[PDB]
Design an enzyme around this catalytic site. Structure first.
Site, PDB file in Angstrom:
ATOM      1  N   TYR B  23       0.860  -1.212   0.000  1.00  0.00           N
ATOM      2  CA  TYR B  23       0.000   0.000   0.000  1.00  0.00           C
ATOM      3  C   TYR B  23       0.888   1.251   0.000  1.00  0.00           C
ATOM      4  CZ  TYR B  23      -4.650  -2.247   0.901  1.00  0.00           C
ATOM      5  OH  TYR B  23      -5.829  -2.925   0.808  1.00  0.00           O
ATOM      6  N   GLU B  68     -15.034   4.968   2.958  1.00  0.00           N
ATOM      7  CA  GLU B  68     -14.881   5.160   1.511  1.00  0.00           C
ATOM      8  C   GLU B  68     -16.269   5.157   0.825  1.00  0.00           C
ATOM      9  OE1 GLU B  68     -12.213   2.107   0.335  1.00  0.00           O
ATOM     10  OE2 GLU B  68     -10.612   2.878   1.732  1.00  0.00           O
TER      11      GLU B  68
END
Lengths: 156, 161
Positions: B23, B68
């Site tokens: 990530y 999100e």
């Protein structure tokens, strides 16, 4: 090593006034009692959690509730300070009342509310807390949190 | 904002989780990240201008928390000088089940993410709690729209440190 955090029992009041209480009952389990707030009165035994040590005095307690609420508490024990992010499905920020019970008695009820939602948009509560009271109860003490908040004695 | 966050804002870092996933996050300001997933279930996914809650929990302990358009919620505790990070990720069932649906430049498919979000199923949540090693770490300053401005595949030669 989690031995430092397992058995920790504490009351803590968020910057937004909410008085919460956790007992970390073991490496994968908390009890918690909410004394004040949106969901004041709500309490939970045996909430499955992820607990990890992020450094010396920085533990993280992470879970998803039958309500769909997800929670990540950073607990800074020696510093007597705590940070909670709370990812409330919209239906709990909107109508938190059904979640204010002894949840363990109403799990399928909570999941039914959960499933119809609305889940979105999520309401995130990010608050520091001062840990006012803190003691070591050891592992697997079912007597630490075994009542709702109001049924505690007036000095607790 | 008091000085607490100045040690985290602008920090741009790449990191690999215990489970192999590389990530990448740039903390673009006190309330915003960009992020780029190089590898994993959601490898290729990246995100500009994700609204985030950042706080400093102690010296070198920042916490960055968001939900999100997919319904994924995340709280990453970032330990920068120790070059170590912890992420909890609360994946709606439909992201753990169909993570491909989320592997895009989300900014160009936000309504698609919300349609998948709404379609569900949301529950049960798949909680993913992993430590990560921060392998690259630099200060790119606040509000740099360039640091994450393309997918991993359209990055330059030797951009992995």
């Amino acid at each position: 090593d989690l031995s430092g955090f397992v058995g920790k029992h504490f009351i803590y009041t968020y910057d937004n006034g909410w008085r919460y209480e956790i007992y970390v009952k073991n490496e994968n389990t908390i009890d918690y009692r909410i004394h004040s707030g949106i969901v004041g009165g709500r309490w939970v035994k045996d909430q499955q959690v992820y607990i990890v040590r992020v450094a010396d005095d920085v533990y993280k307690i992470s879970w998803t509730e039958p309500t769909g609420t997800d929670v990540s508490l950073t607990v800074n024990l020696a510093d007597y300070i705590l940070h909670g992010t709370i990812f409330f499905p919209r239906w709990i920020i909107e109508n938190p009342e059904k979640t204010v019970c002894y949840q363990n008695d109403h799990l399928p009820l909570m999941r039914a509310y959960r499933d119809a939602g609305p889940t979105y948009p999520k309401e995130v509560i990010d608050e520091f807390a001062t840990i006012t009271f803190m003691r070591d109860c050891g592992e697997n003490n079912e007597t630490v949190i075994n009542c709702p908040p109001s049924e505690l004695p007036a000095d607790y």
